[PDB]
Amino acid sequence: RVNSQKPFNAEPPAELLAERFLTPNELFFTQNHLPVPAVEPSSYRLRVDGPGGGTLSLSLAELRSRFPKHEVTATLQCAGNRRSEMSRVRPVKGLPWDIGAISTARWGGARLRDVLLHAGFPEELQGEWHVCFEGLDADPGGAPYGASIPYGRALSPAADVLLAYEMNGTELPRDHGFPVRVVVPGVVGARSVKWLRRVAVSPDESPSHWQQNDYKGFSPCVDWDTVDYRTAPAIQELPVQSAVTQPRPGAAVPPGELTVKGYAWSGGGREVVRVDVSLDGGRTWKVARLMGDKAPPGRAWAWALWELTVPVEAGTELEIVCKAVDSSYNVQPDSVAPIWNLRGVLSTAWHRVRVSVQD
Ligand X SMILES: Nc1nc2c(c(=O)[nH]1)N[C@H]1C(S)=C(S)[C@@H](COP(=O)(O)O)O[C@H]1N2
Q: Which residues bind its own copies (CB under 8 A)?
A: 128, 150, 152, 217, 219-221, 231-233, 235-240, 267-268, 273-274, 276, 282, 284-287, 296-298, 323, 325, 327-335, 338-339, 346, 348
Asked if 192 touches ligand X (CB under 6 A), the answer is: yes
- Helix, strand, coil content of the chain in percent (nearest 5): 10, 35, 50
Backbone φ and ψ for 311, nearest 5 degrees, come out as -70, 135
233-234-236-238 Cα dihedral, nearest 10 degrees: 80
Q: Return the SS3 of 201.
A: strand
Q: Fill in the per-residue mask, 125 to 144: x = in contact with ligand X (CB under 6 A), - = not in contact.
A: ----------x-x-------
Q: Return the SS3 of 5.
A: strand
Q: Which of 23, 31, 245, 266 binds ligand X (CB under 6 A)?
A: 31
Contacting range for Mo ion; rule: CB under 5 A; set: 30-38, 115-123, 195-203, 279-287: 30-38
Cross-strand pairs, 5: 8
C-alpha torsion sign, points 277, 189, 114, 125: negative
Asked if 346 touches Mo ion (CB under 5 A), the answer is: no
Give min distance, CB of 164 to its own copies, in A: 23
Q: Which of residues 190-219 bind Mo ion (CB under 5 A)?
A: 190
Asked if 135 touches Mo ion (CB under 5 A), the answer is: no
| Cβ closest to Mo ion, residue 80 vs residue 108 | 80
| Cβ closest to ligand X, residue 195 vs residue 301 | 195
Q: Which of 28, 44, 165, 301 binds ligand X (CB under 6 A)?
A: 28
Name the pairing type of β-strands 256-265 and 181-183. unpaired
| Cβ closest to ligand X, residue 190 vs residue 264 | 190
| Cβ closest to ligand X, residue 117 vs residue 138 | 138
Beta strands in 15-101 (DSSP E): 30-31, 45-49, 55-59, 70-77
Give min distance, CB of 308 to Mo ion, in A: 30
Q: What is the DSSP string of 296-310?
A: PTT---S-EEEEEEE
Q: Which amino acid is at 280?
A: D
Backbone φ and ψ for 73, nearest 5 degrees, come out as -90, 120
Q: Which of 17, 18, 23, 30 binds ligand X (CB under 6 A)?
A: 30
d(CA 90, CA 313): 36
Q: Which of 74, 78, 92, 132 binds Mo ion (CB under 5 A)?
A: 78
Binding site for Mo ion (CB under 5 A): 31, 78-79, 189-190
